[PDB]
A paper describes a structure:
In the original crystallographic analysis of the ground-state molecule, the choice of space-group symmetry, i.e. trigonal versus hexagonal, was made mostly on the basis of a reduced κ = 60° peak in the native rotation function. After the structure was solved, the original authors revisited the space-group assignment. The possibility of the structure being in space group P62 was considered and rejected. No consideration of P64 is described in the original structure reports. Because the symmetry operations in P31 are a subset of those in P64, the crystal structures of both rhodopsins can be successfully refined in that space group. The model refined in P64 was obtained by superposing the two molecules from the P31 asymmetric unit and retaining the solvent, detergent and additive molecules common to both. Translation of the model also was necessary to align the threefold screw axes in the two space groups. The refinement behavior and statistics for both molecules indicate that space group P64 provides an appropriate description of these crystal structures. The protein molecules in each crystal structure are in identical environments (as far as the X-ray experiment is concerned) and not in two different environments as implied by the models in space group P31. The two crystal structures still differ in the packing interactions between helices 5 in neighboring molecules that are now related by crystallographic symmetry operations rather than by noncrystallographic operations in space group P31.
Owing to their importance in many signal transduction pathways, G protein-coupled receptors (GPCRs) are target molecules for important therapeutic compounds. Rhodopsin, one of the visual pigments in the retina, was the first GPCR to have its crystal structure determined. The structures of ground-state bovine rhodopsin and of one of its recombinant mutants (N2C/D282C) have been solved in space group P31 with two molecules in the asymmetric unit. While investigating the nature of this non-isomorphism, it became apparent that the crystal structures could also be described in space group P64 with one molecule in the asymmetric unit.
Author numbering: 1 to 326, 330 to 331
Write the structure that this text describes.
């Protein structure tokens, strides 16, 4: 056996030397150097100390400024909340797990870490869908005399929560399950075992198809409509050069957010898909540790892209932080 399966775990280390233990029962220092566990800990600590203030700040600045009530403003507020859930719901646990080198909080700890990570990632993915569609509607206005206003914004946000929970929750109640990965200090979906009792196989398929591929199809479609229009379907829409310059700011930003997501999550995606199609194969704990922990920057990069690429949000922020002068 290249790894060590247990009732509820899969250590990617051979147990021929009898050293393997359950990531729920004892430290995993046999897996790698303890200074590496300190690196993860240190890492999570930074993510928490960065993620807590940039998200809250985003959330706070948005609420405080009434003029910040467009679909973008709404979507980014939504991410800010999603990220605070990742930070406080998940990262605190992954931090503490890294410090002890195992899930001292047992499977309940693992569920927290896996849930909020999955939730935050998916909320970001589906939010991208809502934005692309909003860019589509606002930049090409295909449907009739329609208004993607505040009302749809709310419906947009609720929508992201629905899809994301459709992915993150089922493994909490019997469809697949959260399971330790890599050095055993973070938890992901079970790509590792078939465990037919929780119908693992069918969940992983559902996840990759509905919670990765489909959303990418939708965004790709929208991206199609925008390239086309910015080309020859907009010169007939008489888009005044004055609005386009502000609607191109926002369009560029969404595109960057989409690229950042791919940069952040594809590596995890690939390893997961690999493991899934090579169960039992010989891979170490480092194979998934790097992509998994890297993906956790998803809790941080969005508000930063926001601050850096949306002048209106930026100015409001400086205003909030400087009190009065640097508004809404
Ligand atoms: C655990 O990992 C090892 C690799 O580290 C996997 O073992 C590999 O298994 C394949 C078959 O699935 C072996 O291929 C066979 O090679 C012989 C040559 O003697 C050939 O006649 C067969 O037709 C076939 O091609 C491969 O050699 C083997 N690698 C080694 C060196 O062990 C294994 O599948 C993984 N899981 C298990 C079973 O523990
Ligand atoms: C990796 O292999 C090691 C041993 O190579 C596994 O740990 C060992 O597990 C055995 C069987 O559970 C333990 O033996 C116990 O013996 C008493 C006899 O009084 C019996 O009453 C128990 O039911 C049990 O059979 C043994 O203590 C333990 N060895 C130690 C101390 O490490 C280990 O479980 C394997 N990794 C995993 C968790 O898959
Ligand atoms: C709001 C979601 C919080 C998730 C907490 C899950 C903790 C329950 O786990 C206890 C045992 O469940 C293990 C089965 O998987
Ligand atoms: C012009 C029709 C061909 C488009 C097929 C691509 C898939 C579109 O589905 C995405 C939903 O919008
Ligand atoms: C795509 C193949 C897997 C390689 C992982 C990509 C990692 C991105 O490198 C950036 C380094 O930051 C990772 C630090 O997190 C680990 C602690
Ligand atoms: C230098 C990399 C060459 C190895 C490429 C292997 C391609 C095997 O096709 C499998 C299809 O998987 C999708 C993308 O492939 C990337 C790695 O494949 C591993 C499968 O998870
Ligand atoms: C961790 C996030 C760091 C982002 C800092 C951004 C703060 C504002 O930057 C000021 C740069 O000013 C350039 C354009 O701002 C418009 C004001 O003129
Ligand atoms: C640090 C902990 C992590 C990364 C735990 C779990 C992550 C997932 C189950 C991720 C799922 C996916 C997302 C969020 C978006 C890209 C596709 C996906 C299905 C791999
Ligand atoms: C539905 C399939 C999606 C798979 C996405 C794959 C992205 C590639 C990322 C690196 C994976 C390569 N590998 C084998 C080292 O894991
Ligand atoms: Zn409306």
């Amino acid at each position: 056996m290249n790894g060590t399966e247990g009732p509820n775990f899969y250590v990617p280390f051979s147990n021929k030397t009898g050293v393997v233990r359950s990531p729920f029962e004892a430290p995993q220092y046999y897996l790698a150097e303890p200074w590496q566990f300190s690196m993860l800990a240190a890492y999570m600590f930074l993510l928490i100390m960065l993620g807590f203030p940039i998200n809250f700040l985003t959330l706070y600045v948005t609420v405080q400024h009434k003029k910040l009530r467009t679909p973008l403003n709404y979507i980014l507020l939504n991410l800010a909340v999603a990220d605070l859930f990742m930070v406080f719901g998940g990262f605190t646990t992954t931090l503490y797990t890294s410090l002890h080198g195992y899930f001292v909080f047992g499977p309940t700890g693992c569920n927290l870490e896996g849930f909020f990570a999955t939730l935050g990632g998916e909320i970001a993915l589906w939010s991208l869908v809502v934005l692309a569609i909003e860019r589509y509607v606002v930049v090409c206005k295909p449907m009739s005399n329609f208004r993607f206003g505040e009302n749809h914004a709310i419906m947009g946000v609720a929508f992201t929560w629905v899809m994301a929970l459709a992915c993150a929750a089922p493994p909490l109640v019997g469809w697949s399950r959260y399971i330790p990965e890599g050095m055993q200090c973070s938890c992901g979906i079970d790509y590792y075992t078939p465990h037919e009792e929780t119908n693992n196989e069918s969940f992983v398929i559902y996840m990759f198809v509905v919670h990765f591929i489909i959303p990418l199809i939708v965004i790709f479609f929208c991206y199609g409509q925008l390239v086309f229009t910015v080309k020859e379907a907009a010169a007939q829409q008489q888009e005044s050069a004055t609005t386009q310059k502000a609607e191109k700011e926002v369009t560029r930003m969404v595109i960057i957010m989409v690229i950042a997501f791919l940069i952040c999550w594809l590596p995890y995606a690939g390893v997961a898909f690999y493991i899934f199609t090579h169960q039992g194969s010989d891979f170490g704990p480092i194979f998934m540790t790097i992509p998994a922990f890297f993906a956790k920057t998803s809790a941080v990069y969005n508000p930063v892209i926001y601050i850096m690429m949306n002048k209106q949000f930026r100015n409001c922020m400086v205003t909030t932080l400087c009190c009065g002068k640097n508004d809404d």
